[PDB]
Amino acid sequence: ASTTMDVQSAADDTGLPMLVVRGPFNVVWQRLPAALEKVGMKVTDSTRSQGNMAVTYKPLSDSDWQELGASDPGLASGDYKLQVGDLDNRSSLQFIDPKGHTLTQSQNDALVAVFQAAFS
Ligand SMILES: [Cl-]
Ligand SMILES: [Cl-]
Numbered sequence: 001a002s003t004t005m006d007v008q009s010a011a012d013d014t015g016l017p018m019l020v021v022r023g024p025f026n027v028v029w030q031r032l033p034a035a036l037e038k039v040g041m042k043v044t045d046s047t048r049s050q051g052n053m054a055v056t057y058k059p060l061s062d063s064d065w066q067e068l069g070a071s072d073p074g075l076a077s078g079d080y081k082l083q084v085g086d087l088d089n090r091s092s093l094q095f096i097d098p099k100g101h102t103l104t105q106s107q108n109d110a111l112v113a114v115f116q117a118a119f120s
Pocket of ligand 2: 046048
């Protein structure tokens with residue numbers, strides 16, 4: 001078997017979109033910086049005890065998305081915060097803009113393929 005980790009779209013306990021990834025916090029936290037780099041997300045600061053990563057996102061060119069194997073997920077370039085939650089054998093990933101806005105269901109849905117590619 002491979003190093004890929006399963007990724008699914010979900011909602012948090014208030015109904016807002018997030019991703020759920022099939023491995024524990026300790027694994028997903030450690031894998032994230034190099035996986036994020038593949039999809040144009042640079043970690044600029046992080047706090048593991050709070051589960052939070054600050055990311056700056058530069059979208060891939062049309063050809064690079066093609067190489068990765070997912071198309072541009074329709075996220076705006078710029079800064080995001082990524083919150084990594086402990087769900088025992090799984091982890092949650094929830095992106096916010098700097099105003100605290102969560103992704104749309106469509107963006108969050110589009111990031112499922114992006115992150116399955118990044119972890120591969
Ligand atoms: Cl750079
Ligand atoms: Cl760390």
